[PDB]
């Protein structure tokens, strides 16, 4: 609810779209396919907004 600093936040994944939103769809598909033996979801940041 601070439209002033919203862009500067969304770029640093402080508040904004979720991890599986901004990523390229191909990369999301790849992460889903190889979740079992080579994890990737821990690499990326996922924001939570109260």
């Amino acid at each position: 609810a601070t439209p002033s600093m919203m862009p500067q936040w969304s770029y640093m994944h402080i508040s904004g779209q979720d991890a599986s939103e901004y990523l390229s769809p191909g990369l999301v598909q790849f992460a889903r396919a190889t979740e079992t033996y080579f994890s990737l979801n821990n690499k990326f940041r996922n924001p939570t907004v109260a």
């Binding site: 979720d18 996922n46 924001p47 939570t48 907004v49 109260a50």
Partner: peptide, 15 residues
């Protein structure tokens, strides 16, 4: 409603 979420029986026996 729904603009509230943090956006990103036990009786005696019942096994």
């Amino acid at each position: 409603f729904a603009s509230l979420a943090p956006r990103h029986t036990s009786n005696m026996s019942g096994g």
